[PDB]
RNA sequence: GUGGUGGCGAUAGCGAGAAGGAUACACCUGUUCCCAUGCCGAACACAGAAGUUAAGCUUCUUAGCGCCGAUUGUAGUGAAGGGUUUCCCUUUGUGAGAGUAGGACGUCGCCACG
RNA sequence: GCGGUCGCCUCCUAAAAGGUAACGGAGGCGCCCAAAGGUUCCCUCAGAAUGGUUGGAAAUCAUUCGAAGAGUGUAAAGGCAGAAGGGAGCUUGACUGCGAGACCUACAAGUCGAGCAGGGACGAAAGUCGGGCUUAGUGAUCCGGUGGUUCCGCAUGGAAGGGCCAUCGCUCAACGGAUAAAAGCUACCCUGGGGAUAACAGGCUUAUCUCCCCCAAGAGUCCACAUCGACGGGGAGGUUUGGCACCUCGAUGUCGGCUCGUCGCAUCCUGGGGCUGUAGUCGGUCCCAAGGGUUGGGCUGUUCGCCCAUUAAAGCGGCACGCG
RNA sequence: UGAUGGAGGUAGAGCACUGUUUGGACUAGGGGCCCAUCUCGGGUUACCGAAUUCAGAUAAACUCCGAAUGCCAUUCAUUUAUAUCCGGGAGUCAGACUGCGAGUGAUAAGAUCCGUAGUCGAAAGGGAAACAGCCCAGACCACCAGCUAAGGUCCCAAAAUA
């Protein structure tokens, strides 16, 4: 089951990115180091 | 040197390219005559509509 | 004669123009039947000509059928209006263009060969003539 | 049941050999690299050949059996 | 001459045969070293210079294959016409593919050691 | 009408730019991947022969040949072996703000994009990276949900409620989406139009149909051709079953019968003739021949057809399937 | 219109790929026949025969190749006179046939659907007997003048009993 997901910056809680993932292949919340435009630096974003 | 070209055939029922060639040569009504230089371009136009015109030196 | 397999169930009727591309000379047999006109030839016509030729030859000698009915043609049943897709395949044909050597024969005297080819020609729909090997 | 077909994608050459084009002009639309990008030419994500800089378009042959597009500024 | 390194559509290739290592390149000896194999110092990496042109590589011969390929003719066809018009023919211009005559066992550069 | 179809991608049709229709010929899509993305490094396949425990055509291994005959998540086309294919390490550029200029295009959209800035991944560096070899994997607005926001806040401060930004809720698949919300009968029917469009007749076509031929394997005791003639081939006719939709829908009356006929000949009888597997009487087949003639009933609306009884014969067709 | 340079895979042709395919050679191998059966090893049909090879075909959805044309472009050349853009006003969205290239159809249709050029539509005049779409040719008018196109010249009926 592949679903659209939102990656939110952990630092400022800003829903910066939209992506998608297969729940079965990745049961746990995804986490990626992405650039947060609000904070203007690379931060850890975790699916919401 | 020179080419005296006379239109001996109607342009009705002819391809638009041939009609445009006649117009570019500057011929009008049937039997309309013009004189042009003997350039390669002019001779090419004459060859294109050879079946509609008669050419003299 | 029918192809074992076909890439496409249905096919264009096509167009025949000019001399045949190849096979305009007798290759295997001593004598051959050359088409002087272009026309479709059905597997039925090919078979009829072949049977006539063999029967007159008394199975003495060898016969080659140079042409093969690769193409298929469809049709629509009576009472079927135009449209609703192409018709179901009906028969098989070989587009034969003038100059094609449809049949060849060998291992028989000249008169027997000429008579056998004459019978085959009357079975076929194209005008033909006899051609000897070179 | 037949009767389906996609919209034509207007592929092919969009600039003539010997033509002057502004930088970034699309020169050739293609599926795959039917023609390769040459001098001052880039290839887009969908294989489209575009001019990097202003210049004259030239279609050369890349070796024995491959074509190529270059843009030569004047 | 050899080693690097490039340009030009293989006319630069392939096959076959032959000669050479002066240097050079090579095989070649090892795994202590950085480095490594989903096992193997075979590879890659490193150290070294006993032996050998055997192979690679360079040079040379070879038209067997591959490659290039004129001319002529023809198919097709633009244009103008004709015919008995699913097709065919004439004039004019263009003109292949194929088959061939032949060409070709490469050439044009730069660097270093000789 | 029934069946099929409706949006998007690929090929052929498509006539060597592009585009190009048909209820034309073929297939696919409504996803998938946390790597099957990025980068650095490295690697080259499918098959075949030969040899080899279980092991056999074919599991795994080795040598050789092997230029792609493999693979490329997923259809096809194009492309890729200087890889876009395969393996490993590290990573998240499957980045943010954009964007000269282009392609496509009625609009809405769609596509490509160097380059600039911010801050990064890989790599020594060059440099590559704004997803995947490319091209489908999608849906306008309205309305609503969620998060953010230095925006507004109906006297003022708040609030309520909005705006902006981000994103979610479409088989609105009839896929440019009528409405938040909808199936049928009409022969009780009615109106406005159309010969733009069917049924009758005409027209065109002649596949089918009727008729006539070609070849002659054969049947005919022998013997292709007295007679019949397979497998095939070629025509004529315009009476059949059809195809098209050209006149007529501000009306061209439809079957059968009756009355009246008239014409064609591919002749049912009568007339002339050739051949005969013609002894004779009968015939068979073919040729010429359209002058005349070619029936009365039972059944059925019938045409047709069967039957009864006759006749020299009980012809086949056209004439708006002649003639309201 | 010429010159020059390009993009592209059609006609044609070809078999280098993929399909379809014919004959020959050879045969892996499969077949039934007998011996040998532990069904084991032959010996067979010019038995059938894969793949290979030779020769020969074939293709809208094959291509080692590949035109003529058309197309794009050039501060180019000759001739010519339109092209853009901005705005006011429209009508058109039933087309027809003819020639050529295709599909559908039956290589039928005055059929249907495209591409392409012409004409009709919206075009009178001459020819084709009559005959929108074919051939010749574009009517501003007057003439009891002349020359020609297609097509014609024995009579209807102008012109050759050339
Ligand atoms: K015949
Ligand atoms: K070593
Ligand atoms: K050596
Ligand atoms: K060579
Ligand atoms: K990787
Ligand atoms: K709709
Ligand atoms: K009723
Ligand atoms: K009627
Ligand atoms: K007929
Ligand atoms: K006849
Ligand atoms: K007899
Ligand atoms: K009516
Ligand atoms: K008689
Ligand atoms: K009579
Ligand atoms: K009755
Ligand atoms: K009658
Ligand atoms: K009445
Ligand atoms: K082939
Ligand atoms: K083709
Ligand atoms: K205007
Ligand atoms: K047309
Ligand atoms: Mg397409
Ligand atoms: Mg992409
Ligand atoms: Mg040649
Ligand atoms: Mg074209
Ligand atoms: Mg095209
Ligand atoms: Mg990949
Ligand atoms: Mg207030
Ligand atoms: Mg719609
Ligand atoms: Mg009632
Ligand atoms: Mg009414
Ligand atoms: Mg009316
Ligand atoms: Mg009508
Ligand atoms: Mg009528
Ligand atoms: Mg119509
Ligand atoms: Mg009336
Ligand atoms: Mg008679
Ligand atoms: Mg009647
Ligand atoms: Mg009446
Ligand atoms: Mg062809
Ligand atoms: Mg029509
Ligand atoms: Mg009108
Ligand atoms: Mg007129
Ligand atoms: Mg009128
Ligand atoms: Mg005169
Ligand atoms: Mg007179
Ligand atoms: Mg005379
Ligand atoms: Zn943040």
**DSSP symbols for chain A:** -EEEEEEEETTT----EEEEEETTT--SPPEEEEEETTTTEEEEEEE-
| Backbone φ, ψ for residue B23 (5° rounding) | -60, -40
Q: Which of D63, D28, D62, D60 is nearest to D42 (CA)?
A: D28
CA gap D10, C92 in Å, rounded: 39
Q: C122 CA to middle of ligand 37, Å?
A: 30
Q: Which residue has the tokens 């291992």?
A: C107
CA gap B31, D26 in Å, rounded: 50
Contacts of C128 (CB under 8 A, 6+ apart): C33, C34, C35, C36, C102, C117, C121
Q: Which domain holds residue A19?
A: 1-48
Q: C77 CA to middle of ligand 10, Å?
A: 28
Give the DSSP H/E element, type plus range, for residue B54.
Answer: strand B53-56
D65 token code pair: 């059996």
Count other C-beta atoms under 10 Å from residue D71's C-beta.
Answer: 27
Strand E footprint nucleotides (protein C-beta < 7 Å): 9-10, 75-76, 79-81, 86-88
On whether the CB atoms of residues D26 and D49 are closer than 8 A, the answer is yes
CA gap C134, C31 in Å, rounded: 10
CA gap B49, B26 in Å, rounded: 13
On whether the CB atoms of residues C106 and C29 are closer than 8 A, the answer is yes
A14 is in an annotated binding site: no
On whether the CB atoms of residues D19 and D74 are closer than 8 A, the answer is no
Question: Integer distance in angstroms from the first to the last C-alpha of chain A?
Answer: 17
Give the DSSP H/E element, type plus range, for residue C129.
Answer: strand C128-132
Q: Which of A2, A8, A3, A13 is nearest to A34 (CA)?
A: A8
C119 token code pair: 């019978």
C16 token code pair: 């025949």
CA gap C73, C90 in Å, rounded: 6
Question: Integer distance in angstroms from the first to the last C-alpha of chain D?
Answer: 56
User: What determination technique applies here?
Assistant: cryo-EM
Long-range contacts of B18-27 (CB under 8 A, 24+ apart): B18/B48, B18/B49, B18/B52, B21/B45, B21/B48, B21/B49, B22/B49, B22/B52, B22/B53, B25/B49, B25/B53, B27/B53
Q: Which residue has the tokens 């001996």?
A: B8
C-alpha distance from residue D50 to each of D44, D54, D69 (Å): 7, 11, 9
Which B residues 13-32 have CB within 7 Å of strand E?
14-15, 18
Resolution stated for this PDB structure, in Å: 3.0
Count other C-beta atoms under 10 Å from residue C81's C-beta.
Answer: 6
A48 is in an annotated binding site: no
A11 is in an annotated binding site: yes
CA gap D8, D10 in Å, rounded: 6
Q: Which residues of D1-74 form beta strands (DSSP E)?
A: 12-13, 20-21, 26-29, 35-37, 41-43, 49-51, 55-62, 66-72
Q: Which residue has the tokens 């509509």?
A: B49
Give break positions in chain C: residue before each, C–N beyond 2.5 Å.
none
Q: Which of C132, C120, C100 is nearest to C54 (CA)?
A: C120
- Domains contained in chain A, number: 1
CA gap B34, B6 in Å, rounded: 6
CA gap A6, A14 in Å, rounded: 10
Count other C-beta atoms under 10 Å from residue D18's C-beta.
Answer: 9
C-alpha distance from residue B16 to each of B5, B9, B20, B22, B23 (Å): 20, 15, 6, 10, 10
Residue C23 φ/ψ region, left for φ over 0, alpha for ψ in the -120 to 50 degree band, beta for the rest: left
Burial D28-44 (b: 16+ CB within 10 A, else e): bbbeeeebbbbebbebe
Chains contacting D (3 or more CB pairs within 8 Å): none
């Amino acid at each position: 089951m592949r679903v659209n997901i939102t990656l939110e910056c952990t630092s400022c809680k800003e829903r910066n990115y939209l992506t998608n993932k297969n729940k079965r292949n990745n049961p746990d919340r995804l986490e990626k180091q992405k650039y947060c435009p609000r904070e203007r630096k690379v931060t850890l974003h975790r699916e919401t | 040197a020179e080419l005296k070209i006379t239109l001996k055939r109607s342009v009705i029922g002819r391809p638009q390219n041939q009609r445009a060639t006649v117009k570019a040569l500057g011929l009008g009504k049937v039997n309309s005559t013009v004189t042009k230089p003997a350039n390669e371009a002019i001779k090419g136009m004459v060859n294109t509509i050879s079946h509609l015109v008669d050419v003299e030196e | 004669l029918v192809p074992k397999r076909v890439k496409h169930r249905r096919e264009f009727r096509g167009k025949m123009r000019g001399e045949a591309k190849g096979g305009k000379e007798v290759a295997f047999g001593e004598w051959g039947l050359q088409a002087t006109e272009s026309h479709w030839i059905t597997n039925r016509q090919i078979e009829a000509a072949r049977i006539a030729m063999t029967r007159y030859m008394k199975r003495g000698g060898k016969v080659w059928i140079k042409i093969f009915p690769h193409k298929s043609y469809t049709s629509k049943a009576i009472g079927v209006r135009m449209g609703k897709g192409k018709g179901a395949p009906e028969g098989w044909v070989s587009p034969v263009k003038r100059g094609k050597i449809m049949f060849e024969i060998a291992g028989v005297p000249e008169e027997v060969a000429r008579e056998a080819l004459r019978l085959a020609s009357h079975k076929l729909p194209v005008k033909t003539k006899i051609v000897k090997r070179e | 049941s037949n009767g389906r077909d996609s919209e034509s994608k207007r592929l092919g050459a969009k600039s003539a050999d010997g033509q002057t084009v502004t930088g970034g002009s699309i020169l050739y639309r293609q599926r795959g690299t039917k023609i390769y990008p040459g001098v001052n030419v880039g290839i887009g994500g969908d294989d489209t050949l575009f001019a990097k800089v202003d210049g004259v378009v030239r279609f050369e042959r890349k070796g024995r059996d491959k074509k190529q597009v270059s843009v030569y500024p004047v």
